[PDB]
Symmetry: none
Amino acid sequence: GERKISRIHLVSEPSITHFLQVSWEKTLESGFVITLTDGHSAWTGTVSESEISQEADDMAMEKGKYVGELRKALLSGAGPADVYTFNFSKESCYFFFEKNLKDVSFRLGSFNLEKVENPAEVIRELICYCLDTTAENQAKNEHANRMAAEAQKQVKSLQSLLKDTQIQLDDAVRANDDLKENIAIVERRNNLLQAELEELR
Amino acid sequence: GERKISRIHLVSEPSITHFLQVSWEKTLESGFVITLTDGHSAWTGTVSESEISQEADDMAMEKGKYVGELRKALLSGPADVYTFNFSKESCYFFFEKNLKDVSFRLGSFNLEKVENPAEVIRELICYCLDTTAENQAKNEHANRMAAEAQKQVKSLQSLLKDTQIQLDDAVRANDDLKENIAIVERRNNLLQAELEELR
């Protein structure tokens, strides 16, 4: 499947950066695993397709749009706009977040995240993912750069060749115009000469 | 400065991944800070310029070559060329280079256990997220440029062929025209000749 790891700010624990890892198979709508960690402990919960539907109708908003909101809130980086606000109770292990508008805010979602017994394993796997992804993109970046450089050389050569050929074509066209002019002239002369000869014979 | 985070396996804990974070100003030779973590605890030590030089002379190895070995061992080849050992009791960390039929001690330093491992780990994760993001963007951009350039190549090739077909056709047409000009001009010459004979 695929995953997105983001920096998150919890109102309840405001002085340190927390990390939110969300993973899903093909789409977020199919359901997803959501993990929260502070670099020491880790809380994990699973949200099902039906639970997404449930949360969507509790707010009387269309399911698809709600999934879009889930994407913007959970899968992106929270900017200065402060559109979304995040809270987590370590007692109830309940994770809830609001959307902020002008002059009003409403709860956009909430889920239970069970404290894991193996936080270090989760953290190691997370870091490993980041390392692997970096490596993969670095290799792909080199190949892409190789291909780009090669293609760019070919582009310059092809530009030159195309231009030269275009010039030759223009020359040939002008030549063709002049030639048709001359054939007309010479054929007209031929008619007149035959005429002269016939009238004199 | 600079930083490199690498995945390593400790001989004492073979199935568990540890992370080695090495940071240095301009070169590894200047000295470096090294942190080891298992995602729960963290150990940190500092290696000085002089300590590197000393260890190099203790091994009767040339300074540059030893620094090169340190780079390959700590910042970077075939699997398990280098092997890592750490005692959590004595906080003694040593690493060897392994060859066929021989292995030698490459380096060793003391790492004090930090009281704030979570803070260290969070900072490390933050760095990883940034680097991952940067390379994702950089790769994404690179693919855009590559795809664009290759598309341009194909389009130009196609366009070149079409233009070179048009040119060939135009040239042949001109050939036929010049052929005809010659023929009719010959006829005219003969006709003028007749007229002259009749004058």
